[PDB]
Amino acid sequence: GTILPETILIVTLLVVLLADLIQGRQADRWTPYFAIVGLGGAIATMIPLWTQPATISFFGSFISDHLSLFFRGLIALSALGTILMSIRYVEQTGSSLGEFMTILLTATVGGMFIAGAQELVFIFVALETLSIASYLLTGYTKRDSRSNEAALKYLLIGAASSAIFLYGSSLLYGLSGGHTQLPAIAQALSSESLGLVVALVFVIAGISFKISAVPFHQWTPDVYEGAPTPVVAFLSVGSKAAGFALAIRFLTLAFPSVTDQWQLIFTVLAILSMILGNVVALAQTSMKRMLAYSSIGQAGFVMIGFVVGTEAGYASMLFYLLVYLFMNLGAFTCVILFSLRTGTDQISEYAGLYQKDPLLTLGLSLCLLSLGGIPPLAGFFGKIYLFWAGWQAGAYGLVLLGLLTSVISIYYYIRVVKMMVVKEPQEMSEAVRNYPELRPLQVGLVMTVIATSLAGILANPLFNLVNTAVWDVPQ
Amino acid sequence: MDLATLTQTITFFALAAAVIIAALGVVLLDNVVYSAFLLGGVFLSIAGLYILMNADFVSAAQILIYVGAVNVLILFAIMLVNKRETYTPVPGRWLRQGGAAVVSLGVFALLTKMILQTPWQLSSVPPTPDSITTIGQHFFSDFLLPFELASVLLLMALIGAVVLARRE
Amino acid sequence: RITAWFDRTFVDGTGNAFGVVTLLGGDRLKYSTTGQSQAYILTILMGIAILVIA
Amino acid sequence: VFVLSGYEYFLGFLIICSLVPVLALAASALLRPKSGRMIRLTTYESGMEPIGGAWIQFNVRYYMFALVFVIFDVETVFLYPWAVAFHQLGLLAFIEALIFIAILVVALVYAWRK
Amino acid sequence: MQLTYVLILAALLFCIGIYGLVTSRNAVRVLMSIELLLNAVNLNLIGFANYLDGQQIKGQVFAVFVITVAAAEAAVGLAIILAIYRNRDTVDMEKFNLLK
Ligand SMILES: CCCCCCCCCCCCCCCC(=O)OC[C@H](CO[C@@H]1O[C@H](CS(=O)(=O)O)[C@@H](O)[C@H](O)[C@H]1O)OC(=O)CCCCCCCCCCCCCCC
Ligand SMILES: CCCCCCCCCCCCCCCCCC(=O)O[C@@H](COC(=O)CCCCCCCCCCCCCCC)COP(=O)(O)OC[C@H](O)CO
C-alpha cells in the first residue's frame, strides 16, 4: 500500500544485490561505481516525492513526510561520501571491496528506513539492521587486533543498548493496550505514570547510544581508534543522523509531549556532553580519537536544538546536522589521505605538512576551523543558529556553556593547524621528511571542502529546505 | 478453584523456578560448558512458558532457533575456544562485581515497583486459539516492512559473519 | 619593580590558571574511558536508575 | 486463561517419556556389577596408550556449517505461517514471499561460492 | 498465573542477564547473558499479548522478530569472538583493554 515512498530504498536495496552478485562472479570488480550511481539514483528519487505529494503512510508502519526525506537524503549522502574514501583504503588492505560495500549499503538502508519508521516493530528492525552492519564494518580489517577488540566492544555495548531499548518498547506496547503504532500510543496513554517514565528512560538509553550522549558515550573513543577510518566517517555522520531522526520521530510523536521530562534528561545529557567531550578531547594524541571526542561534543551541541523545541531549535538542529556532514566528511577524507600516503599515524606526525603537501593542509585546516566555528565557513553559521535558537527560547545556561566549550574546542582544533603549517625544514616529523609524491578520494575531498566553505554564506537556499522539513515535527 | 487452573498454576511456578535456577547457573557457574547446556535449559523452560500463554507457534519457533540453532552454535564456539582457562585474578574485581550486584538489585526493585503499581488493562476476553494464521496475516498486511527487511538483515549477517570467521 | 612583578605573577598567572586547570581536567578525565567494556555497561546502567530517580 | 486445545497430553506425555530413561537406567543400576575401577577406567585408544597432549586442531569447518544453518533455520520459521495461511492471502503475498525467498537464495549462493 | 507474575519474572531474568553481562569474565558468557536479556524481553511481549491484546496478537509477531534477530546477532557475535581469538589467542574479557 503506497509503496511509492519505497522507490528510494529499494533502489539502494537493488544495488546491495547487484554489487554482490558481481562480486560472486567477477571478484575483481568496479562496484565503487554503480554504487555511487545507486545512491545518486536513490537521492534523485526524492525530488518526485519531496514536494509533489503530501505526507503519505505505507501502512501506518512508515511515513514519508519532508522530515523523513531530509534524514533519508542525509544518510544517503553520508554513505555516498563514505564510498569515495573507502576505495583505495580497503583495497590497500588485503581485503575485498564488494563484501564491504554490501555491508555499507545495508547499513545505509537501515539508517534510511529508521528515519521514516513510526512503528515499534519496524523501528526495532531498522535499528538492528543498522547496528549489525555497524559491528561488521567496525571489525572488517580482521588482521589488526585493535579492529577486533573495537568490534567486540562495540557489539557488546550495542547489543545491551538494544536489549534495553527493546525492554522499553515492550513496556510501551503493554502500557497502551496494544498499539504497536507510535501515534496510536500517544492517544492511548496521556498521563505521567511510573511505567511511562521507565519506558521513556529505557528508550533514551538506546537513543543516546546512537547519538553518543554521555554517559552513553564510552564506546566512540574506543571504536573510532579501532574501526577502519571510512567506517568511522560513515559512523560519525550517518549513525548520528539516524539516531537524531529516530529521536525526533520517537520522543515527539510517540512519547506524549505532555511528558516532557525528556527535555530535562536531554538538558542533562547535553550539558554533560559539552563539558566532557570538549575537555577530554583537549588531551589527545591521535587524530581519530580526537575526532571521536569532538564528535561527542558536537552531538552535545546539536542536543540543544530539540531540547528547547520551538520550530527554530528544530531548524537549528537540522541545519547543524546538515553542515556537520560537510565538516566531518572533509575532516575524515584528509585524515584518510594522510594516513594513506606515508603517515598511518597520529597528530604529532602532522608537523611540517605545509611544505610537502599544501592541498591536504588547506583542505584539513578549513574543515577543522569549520568544526571550531570560524567565520565565513559552514560551521560558524550552524553554531550561531544553534545558539540563537537557544537564547530565543530561554536556555541561557545551555548556550553560555556551548560558547565556552566552543572556545575550548577552538583550542584543540587550531592545535592541529599549528603542526600542519608552523614547521620549518628542521621540525618536520619523521613521516613528512620522507613524504612521497585515489582520484575519487581527491574528488570527494575537494567537494566536501568547497561545500564546507560555501554552505555558510550561501545558506539561504538550504534554510527554506530545513524549514519545510521542520514544519512536520509535532508540537 | 479448579483442576485445570491448579495445573496451569503449578506448571507456571515449576517453569519459573526452572528458569530462575538455570539462569543463575548460566551466569554463576565456573565451568562454561555447564552454562552452555543450562542455556538450552533456560530456552526450553521459556518455550514451555510460551505454550502456557496461548502462544503455541512462537514456542515451537523458539525451540527451533534458540535450543536448536543458537544453542548448537554456542556449543560449537565454546569448544573452539578451549585453552584450559588460566584466568589470573585481577584486583579491581570486587568493585565491579559489587557495582553490578547493587545496580541489578536496584533496577529489579524499580521494575517490580513499576509492575505492581501500574493499572494494566486486562480486557477479559478469551484469546484466539488459531494463533499461527493470525501471525501469517500480520506478516503480509501490517508487518510487511519488517518481514521484507529481515531477509536483507539475514543476508548481511551471513555475509559479515562469513567474512569475519573466514580463514586466510 | 612591584607592578611589573605583579603583572608577571598575579595577573598573568590568574589568566593562565584557568587554562592550566582546563588542561588537567582533560588529562585526568580521559581515564574515565577505562578500556573495559563491562565498565562501559556499568556506566550505561548507572545512567538509568538515576535519571529514573530524577 | 488457557485456550490451547491438545495440551494436557504434551505435559503428561513429556513426564512419562522423561521417566523412561530415568527408570531403565535405574533398573540397570540396581542390578549390574559394581565398580571395575582400576584400569577399566581408561580411554580407548585402539589398545595403545593416549599419546599425550590430546588436542583437536580447531577448525572453522563446523562453525560456518552452523552459521549457515542458523540463517536458514530462521528462514523456515519465517516461511511456515506464510504457507499455513496461503489461502486467505492469495496474490500479492506470493510476490513478497517470493522476494524473501530470492534474497535467501542469493544468501545461499554467496555461502556456496566461498 | 497473572500478568504481574510474568512481568516480574521477565524483570528478574533481565536482572540476572545484566549481572552475567557485567560480571562474567569469559567472552561467550556475555553473549549468553545477552540472550537471557532478549528472552526476558520476549516474555514481556508474550505476556502483554496474551493478557491485553489477545485477539489480534501483536506481541507474538514482534517476539518472532526478536527471536530472529537474536539468532542473527549471536551468529555475528560468535564470529567477532572467533576473530578476536584468532589474534589475541584468549577470551579473557579483562585483556581486551588497549587503553589507560
Ligand atoms: C515376582 C518377582 C519378584 C522379584 C522380582 C525381581 C526382578 C528383578 C530383581 C531380581 C531379584 C534379585 C534382585 C536384586 C538386585 C541385585 O542385583 O542384587 C545383587 C545381586 C548380585 O549378587 C550379589 O553380587 C553382589 C556383588 S555385585 O555387585 O553384584 O557384583 C554381592 O554383594 C552379593 O553378595 C551377591 O549376591 O544380584 C541379584 O540379586 C539379581 C541381579 C540379577 C537378577 C536378574 C533377574 C532378571 C529378571 C529380569 C527378567 C524378568 C522379566 C520381566 C519380569 C517382570
Ligand atoms: C520440548 C521439551 C518440553 C518443552 C516444553 C515443556 C513445558 C510443558 C508444556 C506445558 C504444558 C502446558 C499446561 C498444560 C495445561 C493443563 C490444563 C489444561 O490443559 O486444560 C485442559 C484440561 O486440563 C486437564 O485436565 C489436565 C490436568 C492434568 C494434567 C496433569 C499431568 C498428568 C500427569 C500424568 C498422569 C497422572 C495421573 C495419575 C495421578 C494420580 C483443557 O481441556 P481440552 O484440551 O479438552 O479443551 C477443552 C476442555 O476439555 C474443556 O473446554
Curated annotation (Swiss-Prot), chain A:
Keywords: Membrane, NAD, NADP, Plastoquinone, Quinone, Thylakoid, Translocase, Transmembrane, Transmembrane helix, Transport. InterPro entries: NADH-Q_OxRdtase_suN/2, ND/Mrp_TM, Ndh2_N. One of its GO terms (molecular function) is NADH dehydrogenase (ubiquinone) activity. The keyword Transport applies. It catalyses: a plastoquinone + NADH + (n+1) H(+)(in) = a plastoquinol + NAD(+) + n H(+)(out); a plastoquinone + NADPH + (n+1) H(+)(in) = a plastoquinol + NADP(+) + n H(+)(out). GO terms for biological process: ATP synthesis coupled electron transport; photosynthesis, light reaction. The chain crosses the membrane at residues 2-22, 30-50, 67-87, 97-116, 120-139, 155-175, 194-214, 228-248, 262-282, 290-310, 318-338, 362-382, 384-404, 443-463. Disulfide bonds: none annotated. GO terms for cellular component: plasma membrane-derived thylakoid membrane. The keyword DNA repair does not apply. It is a multi-pass membrane protein. Its EC number is 7.1.1.-. It is found in: Cellular thylakoid membrane. Belongs to the complex I subunit 2 family. NDH-1 shuttles electrons from an unknown electron donor, via FMN and iron-sulfur (Fe-S) centers, to quinones in the respiratory and/or the photosynthetic chain. The immediate electron acceptor for the enzyme in this species is believed to be plastoquinone. Couples the redox reaction to proton translocation, and thus conserves the redox energy in a proton gradient. Cyanobacterial NDH-1 also plays a role in inorganic carbon-concentration. NDH-1 can be composed of about 15 different subunits; different subcomplexes with different compositions have been identified which probably have different functions. This is NAD(P)H-quinone oxidoreductase subunit 2. It comes from Thermosynechococcus vestitus (strain NIES-2133 / IAM M-273 / BP-1).
UniProtKB/Swiss-Prot annotation, chain D:
It is a multi-pass membrane protein. Its EC number is 7.1.1.-. The chain crosses the membrane at residues 10-30, 64-84, 89-109. It holds the Pfam family Oxidored_q4. Belongs to the complex I subunit 3 family. PANTHER family: NADH-UBIQUINONE OXIDOREDUCTASE CHAIN 3. This is NAD(P)H-quinone oxidoreductase subunit 3. It comes from Thermosynechococcus vestitus (strain NIES-2133 / IAM M-273 / BP-1). The gene is ndhC.
